[PDB]
């Protein structure tokens, strides 16, 4: 014990366009910077949840005694600009 | 000095032989048991069987009696462990141990450095990197640029920024396993709104298994 | 001395997705095979003329006593998706 | 035997001096009238102005009278031309001439080589290839692959296909000259539709004032 906690960092890039020219898309949400390894990823699409094709795994970063977390999300790009951009949600402990 | 050095890390398919070594020096190779554990990834440890130099007197475990065999070479002082017909579920870290001067004939205090060992379905691939553009459009906070690599078969990847430049504010995270067997992962760095594109903001992907050169921009 | 006439080419490529997904857009249309080098270049859009932006030489290839001709129209990639897609008309001697 | 040679290829910027050199050997470099010939490209012969090697008797031209100025030294028999406050409109070929043992005094029988000067102060902007996708979605006829060349300053850029192979099919389009003053080209190659990508269909432009070696397929 003894480590403070840390709340955990909310980076997500919209879709690249390199990965956007063929028939593909992947939604990258970047998680770190939090000490307990318990988190999971939730995708929603304009507040409907979407589960299709997603992963999610808490490696760590390194002796800085935190973890990190990734998740993607790979879909059609026809489903990209059928709505509006995709919000990441952490749960670590609260809505964020 | 005694030491044990094993070969490197060896990545097959299922249905294909495989024989890794473990070479121990700085001892007599003659007396002390050599064994192999297994140890799989968020497992605990599993020994397999064990060997000795002088004579074979191989003594295996009740579930790896006739799954896996062991053998050795006196005149060399080489361990071997060979595998044959290998699964899905053969993919774990293999360790080499050997008794020490003091304790029980299997009590396995001296380690070896650890063989990565990996088998798959699915067959080598080049990654395509991809350049994550920042938030051009919401340039509040602080930018951050960087690469997407995907669609790879072998684990380590080595991404740099401007041929190693740019030490501070690059963190690497490490890949997921997606359902396919391809690995995923990603490289940003935190920079200034204000700096975008300094001298270059190229990324630099290498690929060892597949001879792969990508530098791009972004 | 010259050459008798011949027909010139109608090759259009749509816009390539690399410079479609990002901010820029271009249609490239290929005119060549052609003695008479005078040759003007229309974009339409649905019917509609368009000339915002739009550049075309008349240069020769290589010694088979012909020339080239070659036309770029730049425009925003939402432009592109906002209407069908666009239409070159060469005018060498009819509509073609 | 009476040879005219002149200096290398000078690039240089505008609002900086030049001095070309244009030496003659193998006459009595004193009696023959030398001069300067501008030469656009595209365009016509343009005088400038001559010299006496003997002594300092210069006419320019009364489009060139204070533009340019003309100098020799006899001691070496070598001919100059200086130049001040260089301009975008300077960049033409410029030959060196002199008077034959037959003929008028401004005749200029004789010629040199030719010194290639360009300046062309703008900004060299790096080749963006986009490779143009063939019609995918109607593959009725032949069909076409090729990349867009773009966002290019200097006009001479070489594109083959797969390091020079497929020779046939392959036509290169000259650039045209935007308005932003960045060129653009396009080369393509007729393959049949049911070959789509044979080997690789790869894409090979080179740039040399830039030194980019961008490869993409498509």
């Known amino acids: 014990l003894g480590q403070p906690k840390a709340a955990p960092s909310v980076t997500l890039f919209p879709p690249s366009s390199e990965e956007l020219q063929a028939n593909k898309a992947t939604l990258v949400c970047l998680i770190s910077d939090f000490y307990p390894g318990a988190v999971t990823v939730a995708w929603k699409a304009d507040s409907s949840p979407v589960k299709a094709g997603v992963e999610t795994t808490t490696p760590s970063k390194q002796s800085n005694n935190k973890y990190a977390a990734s998740s993607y999300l790979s879909l059609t790009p026809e489903q990209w600009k059928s709505h509006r951009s995709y919000s990441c949600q952490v749960t670590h402990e609260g809505s964020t | 000095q005694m030491q044990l050095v094993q070969s490197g890390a060896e990545v097959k398919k299922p249905g294909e032989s495989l024989k890794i070594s473990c070479k121990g020096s700085?001892?007599?190779?003659?007396?002390?048991?050599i064994g192999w554990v297994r140890q799989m990834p968020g497992k605990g440890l599993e020994w397999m069987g064990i060997?000795?130099?002088?004579?074979?007197?191989?003594r295996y475990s009740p579930s790896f009696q006739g799954q896996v065999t062991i053998s050795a070479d006196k005149s060399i002082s080489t361990a071997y462990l060979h595998w044959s017909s290998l699964k899905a579920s053969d993919t774990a870290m293999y360790y080499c141990?050997?008794?020490?001067?003091?304790?029980?004939?299997?009590?396995?205090?001296?380690w070896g450095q650890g063989t990565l060992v990996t088998v798959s379905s699915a067959s080598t691939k080049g990654p395509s990197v991809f350049p994550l553009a920042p938030s051009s459009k919401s340039t509040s906070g602080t930018a951050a640029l960087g690469c997407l690599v995907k669609d790879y078969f072998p684990e380590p990847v080595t991404v740099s920024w401007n041929s190693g430049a740019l030490t501070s504010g690059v963190h690497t995270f490490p890949a997921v396993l997606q359902s396919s067997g391809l690995y995923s992962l990603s490289s940003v760095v935190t920079v200034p709104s204000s700096s975008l594109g300094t001298q270059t903001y190229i990324c630099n992907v290498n690929h060892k298994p597949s001879n792969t050169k990508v530098d791009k921009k972004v | 001395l010259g050459q008798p006439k011949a027909a010139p080419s109608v090759t259009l490529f749509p816009p390539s997705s690399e410079e479609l997904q990002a901010n820029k857009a271009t249609l490239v249309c290929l005119i060549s095979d052609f003695y008479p080098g005078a040759v003007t270049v229309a974009w339409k859009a649905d019917s509609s003329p368009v000339k915002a932006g739009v550049e075309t030489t008349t240069p020769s290839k290589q010694s088979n006593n012909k020339y080239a001709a070659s036309s770029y129209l730049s425009l925003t990639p939402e432009q592109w998706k906002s209407h069908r897609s666009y239409s070159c008309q060469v005018t060498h001697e009819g509509s073609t | 035997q009476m040879q005219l040679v002149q200096s290398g290829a000078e690039v240089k910027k505008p609002g900086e001096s030049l001095k070309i050199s244009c030496?003659?050997?193998?006459?009595?470099?004193?009696?023959?009238?030398?001069?300067?010939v501008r030469q656009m490209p595209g365009k016509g012969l343009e005088w400038?102005?001559?010299?006496?090697?003997?002594?300092?008797?210069?006419?320019?031209?009364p489009s060139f009278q204070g533009q340019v100025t003309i100098s020799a030294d006899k001691s070496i028999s070598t001919a100059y031309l200086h130049w001040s406050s260089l301009k975008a409109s300077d960049t033409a070929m410029?030959?060196?001439?002199?008077?034959?043992?037959?003929?008028?005094?401004?005749?200029?029988?004789?010629?040199?080589?030719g010194t290639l000067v360009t300046v062309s102060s703008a900004s060299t902007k790096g080749p963006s290839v986009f490779p143009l996708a063939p019609s995918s979605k109607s593959t009725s006829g032949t069909a076409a692959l090729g990349c867009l060349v773009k966002d290019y300053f200097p006009e001479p850029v070489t594109v083959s296909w797969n390091s020079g192979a497929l020779t046939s099919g392959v036509h290169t389009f000259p650039a045209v000259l935007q308005s932003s003053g960045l060129y653009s080209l396009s080369s393509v190659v007729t393959v049949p539709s049911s070959s789509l990508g044979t080997q690789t269909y790869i894409c090979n432009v080179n740039h040399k004032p830039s030194n980019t070696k961008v490869d993409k397929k498509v």
């Open positions: 141990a050997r008794q020490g001067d003091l304790g029980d004939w299997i009590l396995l205090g001296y």
């Open positions: 700085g001892y007599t190779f003659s007396y002390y048991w």
């Open positions: 060997i000795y130099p002088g004579d074979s007197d191989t």
